[PDB]
């Protein structure tokens, strides 16, 4: 890794934020130089605002072009909502079923692995003999694979004993009844 | 609740830039600037929508022109390098002779230039590998994913080699079947 020549970076983000689907929409145009946001257009505000000194000129210059400000204010409909509609089918309503597996580790530890699922809202529970274990449970938290699936690991610290049935239970919008995987001493 | 983000950048003096849509942290697509074609993150996205690729190039031209202005306006203040955190992990839990995928997840860095090499037993591997573009983060740093499909063997050992201006030396991230 050579070439210490100084770098200069410009980033544009148009963030459409949705609440209860189309019900409430907010549009955020952020302009960022060298990782610092310098000026933005917040649909809640309705005009450009400077975030740092560096952004002041653009705010004024763009604000003074009133035909553009209107284009922008409409964008929550012409862009944000329009786009929401086009993508919903394969994004908002994407459902992939988790795959669940159990296996022991040492540190004894039990490991529940839930992989390959979408969306990321999920509930994973441990059961000892059908008594939910709410303590001694340590989770890896959501992990985004980058391929539109998630994975996570939930660990139960426990000293097993034959005659004990451990269950990992998973709830997720992709399935109707919880998935369960059982592991025995 | 959800968020869609059209994210684009121009970088100087490298003269690199990208255009992409992000849904809740996932790439919907980006535009291949050279081929001027829309590249859907998952093939099946491409049958339920389309996008005017040329538009991206126009946007990138505006981005570049504005960069050039900001560069001078800042009086040539350069970006500060932020080295990434790197993490290797598998698509699913590993069972020998069951095909899996190794994931190199490069995160929390800027500017968006990295070098990533897959190292099997210390040797470079390129067979079947793939990667993502630079994905956006709220603090304006970047994410990037590299992928290496593989057969889990007990003799085989793996490394993800990552270089970036914010690092004093390549960052190696190890993974073996244990």
């Amino acid at each position: 890794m050579g070439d210490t020549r100084p770098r200069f970076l410009w980033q544009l983000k148009f963030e459409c934020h949705f609440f209860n689907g189309t019900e409430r929409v907010r549009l955020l145009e952020r302009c960022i130089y060298n990782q610092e946001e310098s000026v933005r257009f917040d649909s809640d505000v309705g005009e450009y605002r400077a975030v740092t000194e560096l952004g002041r000129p653009d705010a004024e210059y763009w604000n003074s072009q009133k035909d553009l400000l209107e284009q922008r204010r409409a964008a929550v409909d012409t862009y944000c909502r329009h786009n929401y509609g086009v993508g919903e089918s394969f994004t908002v309503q994407r459902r992939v079923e988790p795959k669940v597996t159990v296996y022991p580790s040492k540190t004894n530890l039990l490991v529940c692995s839930v992989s390959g699922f979408y969306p990321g809202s999920i509930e994973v529970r441990w059961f000892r003999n059908g008594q939910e274990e709410k303590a001694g449970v340590v989770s890896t938290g959501l992990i985004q694979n980058g391929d539109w699936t998630f994975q996570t690991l939930v660990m139960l610290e426990t000293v097993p004993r034959s005659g004990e049935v451990y269950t990992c239970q998973v709830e997720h919008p992709s399935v109707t009844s919880p998935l369960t995987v059982e592991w025995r001493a | 609740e959800h968020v869609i983000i059209q994210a684009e950048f121009y970088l100087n003096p490298d003269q690199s830039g990208e255009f992409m849509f992000d849904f809740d942290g996932d790439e919907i697509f980006h535009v291949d600037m050279a081929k001027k074609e829309t590249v859907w993150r998952l093939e099946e996205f491409g049958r339920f929508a389309s996008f005017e690729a040329q538009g991206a190039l126009a946007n990138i031209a505006v981005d570049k022109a504005n960069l050039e202005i900001m560069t001078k306006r800042s009086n040539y203040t350069p970006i500060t390098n932020v080295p990434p955190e790197v993490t290797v992990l598998t698509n699913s839990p590993v069972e020998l002779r069951e095909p899996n995928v190794l994931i190199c997840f490069i995160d929390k860095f800027t500017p968006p230039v990295v070098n990533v090499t897959w190292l099997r037993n210390g040797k470079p591997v390129t067979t079947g590998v793939s990667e993502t573009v630079f994905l956006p983060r709220e603090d304006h740093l970047f994410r990037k994913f590299h992928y290496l499909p593989f057969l889990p063997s007990t003799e085989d050992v793996y490394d993800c080699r990552v270089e970036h201006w914010g690092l004093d030396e390549p960052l190696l991230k190890h993974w073996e079947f244990d």
Binding site: H82, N83, V86 | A49, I69
Partner: peptide
């Protein structure tokens, strides 16, 4: 068709 939003140009002859 998915819609693109277009960034504004900055003032080229600055004050």
């Amino acid at each position: 068709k998915m819609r693109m939003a277009t960034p504004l140009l900055m003032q080229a002859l600055p004050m």
